[PDB]
Amino acid sequence: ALRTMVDPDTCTSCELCYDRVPEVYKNRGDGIAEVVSPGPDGWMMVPPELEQEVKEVTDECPAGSIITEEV
Ligand code: SF4
């Protein structure tokens, strides 16, 4: 399975992730991105149909703010 998170410390509010994959990411309110449904650890589990999309925006994030991993 795949999970993902956003590091708000480095996010530059470029809007790519939550424009491209609104299923996974959203504007938290001030331009910075956050996953839509995070756990207490902040991680969001990704639906299998959205894995490749998530993996793509992870590579495309200009600030390397999106952390994604296989679990
Ligand atoms: S793609 Fe990266 S820099 Fe752009 S809004 Fe999402 S987390 Fe922030």
Kindly provide the b/e burial profile for residues 7-36, where b requires at least 16 CB atoms within 10 angstroms of the residue's own CB: eeeebeeeebbbeebeebbbeeeeebbbbe
Is the Cβ atom of 13 under 6 angstroms away from ligand 1? yes
The amino acid at 9: D
Cα 17 to ligand 1 centroid, rounded to whole Å: 6
Burial 43-66 (b: 16+ CB within 10 A, else e): bbebeeeebebbbebbeebeeebb
- Domain spans in the chain, listed from the N-terminal domain onward: 1-71
Distance 11 CA to ligand 1 centre (A): 5
DSSP strands (E only) in 1-71: 2-6, 25-27, 33-35, 44-46, 66-70
What experimental approach yielded this model?
X-ray
Q: Which of 58, 40, 62 is nearest to 2 (CA)?
A: 58
Residue with the two structure tokens 């992730």: 17
Query: What is d(CA 69, CA 31) in angstroms, rounded to the nearest whole number?
Result: 24
Q: Nearest Cα to 44, choosing from 6, 4, 1? A: 4
